[PDB]
Amino acid sequence: RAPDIDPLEALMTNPVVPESKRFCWNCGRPVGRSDSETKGASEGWCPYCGSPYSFLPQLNPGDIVAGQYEVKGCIAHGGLGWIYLALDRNVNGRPVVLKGLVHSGDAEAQAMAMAERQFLAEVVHPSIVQIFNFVEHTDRHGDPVGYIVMEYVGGQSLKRSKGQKLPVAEAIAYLLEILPALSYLHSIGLVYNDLKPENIMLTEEQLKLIDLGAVSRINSFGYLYGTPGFQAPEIVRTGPTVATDIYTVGRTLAALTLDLPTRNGRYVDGLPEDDPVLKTYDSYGRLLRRAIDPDPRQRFTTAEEMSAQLTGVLREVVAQDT
Ligand SMILES: Nc1ncnc2c1ncn2[C@@H]1O[C@H](COP(=O)(O)OP(=O)(O)OP(O)(O)=S)[C@@H](O)[C@H]1O
Ligand SMILES: [Mg+2]
Ligand SMILES: [Mg+2]
Ligand SMILES: [Zn+2]
User: Fold this and answer.
1) Where, by residue number, does ATP bind?
2) Which member of 56, 135, 180, 302 has the greatest number of CB atoms within 10 A?
3) 209 lines ligand 1 (CB under 6 A)
4) What is the rounded CA–CA span in Å between residue 286 and residue 103?
């Protein structure tokens, strides 16, 4: 007899953060580490900045959030802590995903965080993860914390290491599917702000953008955070813009296709000279340089314009590959 297995079990991870992956959310320094003297604590305070940390899950299997979401366990751990899998009692017990909103804060701070992100529930595009709700629950210490509720997205991110870079045609075809989602965001006065391979999910059917935490209004300065090697150099002066999102498209294509030099764990600005890929596909190299131009006024004016040039480049890459 063949067994009846719950397919959710294979989707979840052991709810322990390995020591090599423990960092302070505030100052970025390693925390919760074992030394030649003492064992690393799963929760405590950062010895350098004094910020509280916890690598323990804040929602346990069987917990019910806002009388609606039945927690099943953990999917992954990130910058905002654990990412939980839950079953939505309003939508037939469909598995959904919960993620925290702020690393720390009192009741008023949590309420303000939920309210400021509520607009994401109105973002509707087939290539952008759907946000279903914003809910409150108590953490492992009894203090109320806010959660974003989102659609469960299948597959894995486009993040590729030095040995598994995508062929140019594949990477372009992927970004051509992403660019209309950016055009859609720009049409409603929003910037995605966090485009990078790790935030793009590849499913059995399509591509989907996740991690809407950086989504912001054009020319606003409330959120300036970004990854060195992906973020536009002028973000401090202009705030997020269509031009900063175009720059991230260029950086994303480069990170998916090129063996980019890295320094202190981040990709260096610009593109390497004599790179075999850029010498092979000239129009592609020209498009990337335009997209990452240090002058934002020199970049593609709109995502629709970039898509039009990119379509032309795909035809040329496909023809060259023969
Ligand atoms: N909606 C989702 N559906 C399925 N898996 C998800 C979903 N959101 C996140 N995950 C998983 O969790 C991983 C990390 O998700 P992210 O939102 O990028 O978290 P992050 O690393 O903490 O970046 P931050 O918190 O937003 S600043 C993804 O690579 C997926 O494996
Ligand atoms: Mg992310
Ligand atoms: Mg984020
Ligand atoms: Zn710290």
Assistant:
1) 75-83, 99
2) 135
3) no
4) 41
